[PDB]
Design a protein around this ligand. Structure first.
Ligand SMILES: [Mg+2]
Ligand SMILES: [Mg+2]
Ligand SMILES: [Mg+2]
Ligand SMILES: [Mg+2]
Ligand SMILES: [Mg+2]
Ligand SMILES: [Mg+2]
Ligand SMILES: [Mg+2]
Ligand SMILES: [Mg+2]
Ligand SMILES: [Mg+2]
Lengths: 102, 79, 81, 109, 174
RNA sequence: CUGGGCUACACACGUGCUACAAUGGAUGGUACAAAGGGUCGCGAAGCCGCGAGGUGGAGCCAAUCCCAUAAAACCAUUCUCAGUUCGGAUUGUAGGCUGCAACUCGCCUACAUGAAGCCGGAAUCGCUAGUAAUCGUGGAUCAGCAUGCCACGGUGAAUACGU
C-alpha cells in the first residue's frame, strides 16, 4: 500500500499523468515482498528546451530509494526512472542476504 | 391465597419527610421501624422523599422557576 | 461593542430603517454594514445584507434581536466533497 | 435521596457534584447555608441536616429543568438561520476554531 | 384500604349526579390491575428473567407466573415454550392499596414529572400506563437494582367508554 | 473604496502543547535568582469587584521608581487506586479588554456540561556535564492577539567494555 505525492511545478498534474506515474511505480511491489506503507515524493519540471525531469524518493525502512532523470519528454523519463530504482532494491536486498551467508 | 409462596406483606404507615404528610398503605418492605398512628397502626415508619403533595404535576406547583422576555432583557440590559 | 459602552449600531443603516417605519416592510433595505447588532426597531423588517459578492435578503424576527446582521448571511459556499 | 442517587462511601462535598447542574464551587455555598461541615460522610448526615440541604438546593436549578433549557437554546438557533445553527446542525466546531485538522471531539471518529 | 372507602362514599355520589345513571350498579369501577414485563432479551441468559420475577414478587406482594412464548419467530431467535415475561394480577384490597401507593408516592418520582398521558385509552374504557424505570416504586433500592427495565401496569375498568373512565380516574387522583 | 477571502474540510503527512495520576490532585504557610523593558511610556499605594478588571495618581527620561509576589522545592491536613477529588476538549449562559468595528475571524474571566485518554503496533528521534530531564522569567514584531522564535536563571542524572 503506497501513498503518492506529486509536486507539479511549471506543469499541470493532469489525471492521465497521475495514472501513468501511479501504475509504473506500482510494479516495484513484486521485489520487496513487504513494502511497509510509505509516502512517495515525486517532482516534475520542464524547461524551455523541451526537457523533462522526474525525481522519486521512496523511504523504505532500511532502503532509501532514489533516482533522478532528464530526457526529452515526460513519459520517457518515467519509464527510464524504474531502471535506476529497481537496481537499488536489487542491490540492497541481495547485499544483505548473501553476505550474512558468507 | 396460596400459602408459603408469597412474600410478606405486613402493613406499614407512610410519612413524608418533606412536609410531614401522614399516609397509611401497607407495603412489602419491612424497613425495620415501628410507629403507631390513627388509633393504632403499629408498623414501620417508612420515610420517603417528596410525595404527590409537592410534585409538579401531582400538586399545585406554581413556578419553581422564572421566564424570559429577551427584548425586555435587551431593553433592561442595554438600558 | 461587547462592553457596557455599547451597543454598536451603524449610523446610515440605523437611520434608513428609522424613516422606513412608515413603509412597514414595504421596501427592501440594501446595506453593507454587517457589524450592527439587530435592534428591536428592526423587528419585522427585511434587509439585504452583502455576503461578499451579492445581497441576500433576511426577514427580521423577534428572536433575531441582539445578534449581528452577518450571522444570517453565510459567506463560504460549502456543498460537501 | 437528593434528586437522584448519590454515592454512599463518598463525601457530601464530592457526592453532591453527581447531579447535573451543580459543581465543586457551588457545593461550598449549599454546604454553608446548610450549616454542616464539609468533611462529613454521606451516610452520617441526619434528617435535619439533609432537610436543610434539600431546601437550599431547591432554589438553585437542577437536572431536567436545566437539561431542557440548554437544548431549547440550541433549537432556537437551528431554524432562525444564524451561523451557529449550521455548525450545530452539521456537527462542525461552533466557536472560532479551525477545521482543516483537529475537530474530532465534535465531529467524532 | 381507605381509597376504596372514599371511592364508594364520595366519588360514587359524584358519578351519580354527574352522569345521571339509571340504577346504582351502572356506575363504573375498577375491576383488576394487571402488571406485565418483557424478558425477550433473556433468550440466552435465563437468569435475568428470574431476577425480574423476584423483583415483581417483591414489589407487588404476590409471586408472578412466568409466561411462555406462543410462537417460534426466527427474527427474535425464538422457540415455542420459551419463558418470556411475567404477570401479577391484583383483585380487591391489594388492587386498591397498590393503586393508592402508585398515585400518591410512585408517580411523584419520575425524572420528568409533567403529567400522565391524556391519550392512552384503548377506546373502550381501559387505561394502560407505561412506566419504564425500575425504582419509580419506592420499595426497591438502588443497590439491589441489577438492570434498569420497565413495566406495564394496566387498569381495567367497567366503564363503557373513554370519557367516564377519564373522570373516574381523575376522581381517584390520576 | 466597501464587502469577502488567505481561518474551508470526507481525508493524508510533518512539527509542537496537554494528559493518561499517589514521586499525584486539592487546601493553608513560607524561602531562594539571573537576564532585560519603560516619555504621545512604565504605571505603585489606596478604594471596589469572587474573577478577568475599574477609579486613582505617587515616583521615574532611571545601579534611584515601576514592570515584579519567581515556579518547581520545603512544611501541615485531606483524598485512598476508581475513567476517579486524574484529564481537560466540547458546549449553554453571564462578563471584562483593545479597537470606528470581535458574525465570518481576537484574547481573558465567572457558573454549569463533562469527551478521548489508564503509557501507545511496525518504525523512528535527541543527548557525553551544569549536558539530557524538569520548572519558572524576559524581549522582538505588537492598539489587541504565540502551545512559535530569540535569550535568562532554579533543581539536576545515567552510561561510554569497545570499533
Ligand atoms: Mg517499463
Ligand atoms: Mg483562531
Ligand atoms: Mg496562512
Ligand atoms: Mg482537577
Ligand atoms: Mg466572539
Ligand atoms: Mg468550571
Ligand atoms: Mg474507553
Ligand atoms: Mg489507573
Ligand atoms: Mg504581545
Amino acid at each position: 500500500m503506497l501513498k503518492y505525492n506529486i509536486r507539479g511545478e511549471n506543469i499541470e498534474v493532469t489525471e492521465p499523468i497521475r495514472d501513468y506515474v501511479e501504475k509504473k511505480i506500482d510494479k516495484l511491489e513484486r521485489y520487496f515482498t513487504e513494502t511497509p506503507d510509505a509516502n512517495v515524493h515525486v517532482n516534475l519540471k520542464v524547461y524551455s528546451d523541451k526537457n523533462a525531469k522526474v525525481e522519486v524518493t521512496i523511504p523504505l525502512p532500511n532502503l532509501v530509494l532514489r533516482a533522478e532523470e532528464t530526457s526529452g519528454d515526460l513519459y520517457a523519463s518515467i519509464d527510464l526512472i524504474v531502471d535506476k530504482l529497481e537496481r537499488q532494491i536489487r542491490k540492497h536486498k541481495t547485499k544483505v542476504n548473501r553476505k550474512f551467508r558468507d | 391465597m396460596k400459602t408459603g409462596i408469597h412474600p410478606e406483606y405486613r402493613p406499614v404507615v407512610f410519612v413524608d419527610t418533606s412536609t410531614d404528610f401522614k399516609f397509611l398503605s401497607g407495603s412489602t418492605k419491612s424497613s425495620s421501624e415501628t410507629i403507631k398512628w390513627e388509633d393504632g397502626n403499629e408498623y414501620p415508619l417508612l420515610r420517603v422523599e417528596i410525595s404527590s403533595d409537592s410534585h409538579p404535576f401531582y400538586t399545585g406547583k406554581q413556578k419553581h422557576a422564572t421566564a424570559d422576555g429577551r427584548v425586555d432583557r435587551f431593553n433592561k440590559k442595554y438600558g | 461593542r461587547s462592553l457596557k459602552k455599547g451597543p454598536f449600531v451603524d449610523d446610515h443603516l440605523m437611520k434608513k430603517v428609522e424613516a422606513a417605519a412608515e413603509s412597514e416592510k414595504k421596501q427592501v433595505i440594501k446595506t453593507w454594514s454587517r457589524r450592527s447588532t439587530i435592534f428591536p426597531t428592526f423587528v419585522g423588517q427585511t434587509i439585504a445584507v452583502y455576503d461578499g459578492r451579492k445581497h441576500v435578503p433576511v426577514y427580521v424576527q423577534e428572536d433575531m434581536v441582539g445578534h449581528k446582521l452577518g450571522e444570517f448571511a453565510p459567506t463560504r459556499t460549502y456543498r460537501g466533497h | 435521596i437528593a434528586g437522584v442517587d448519590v454515592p454512599r462511601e463518598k463525601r457530601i462535598v464530592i457526592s453532591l457534584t453527581y447531579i447535573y447542574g451543580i459543581g465543586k464551587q457551588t457545593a461550598k455555598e449549599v454546604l454553608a447555608e446548610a450549616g454542616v461541615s464539609e468533611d462529613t460522610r454521606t451516610r452520617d448526615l441526619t434528617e435535619e441536616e439533609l432537610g436543610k440541604i434539600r431546601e437550599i438546593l431547591d432554589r438553585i436549578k437542577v437536572e431536567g429543568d436545566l437539561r431542557r433549557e440548554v437544548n431549547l437554546n440550541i433549537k432556537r438557533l437551528i431554524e432562525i438561520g444564524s451561523y451557529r445553527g449550521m455548525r450545530h446542525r452539521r456537527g462542525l466546531p461552533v466557536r472560532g476554531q479551525n477545521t482543516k485538522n483537529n475537530a474530532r471531539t465534535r465531529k467524532g471518529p | 384500604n381507605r381509597l376504596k372507602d372514599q371511592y364508594l362514599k364520595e366519588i360514587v355520589p359524584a358519578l351519580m349526579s354527574k352522569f345521571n345513571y339509571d340504577s346504582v350498579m351502572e356506575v363504573p369501577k375498577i375491576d383488576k390491575i394487571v402488571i406485565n414485563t418483557g424478558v425477550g432479551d433473556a433468550t440466552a441468559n435465563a437468569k435475568v428473567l428470574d431476577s425480574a420475577v423476584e423483583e415483581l414478587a417483591l414489589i407487588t406482594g404476590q409471586k408472578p407466573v412466568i409466561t411462555k412464548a406462543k410462537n417460534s419467530i426466527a427474527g427474535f431467535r425464538l422457540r415455542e415454550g420459551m419463558p418470556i415475561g411475567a404477570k401479577v394480577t391484583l383483585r380487591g384490597e391489594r388492587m386498591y392499596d397498590f393503586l393508592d401507593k402508585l398515585v400518591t408516592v410512585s408517580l411523584p418520582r419520575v425524572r420528568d414529572f409533567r403529567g400522565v398521558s391524556k391519550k392512552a385509552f384503548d377506546g373502550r374504557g381501559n387505561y394502560t400506563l407505561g412506566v419504564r424505570e425500575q425504582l419509580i416504586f419506592p420499595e426497591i433500592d438502588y443497590d439491589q437494582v441489577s438492570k434498569v427495565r420497565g413495566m406495564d401496569v394496566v387498569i381495567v375498568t367497567t366503564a363503557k367508554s373513554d370519557e367516564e373512565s377519564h373522570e373516574l380516574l381523575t376522581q381517584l387522583g390520576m
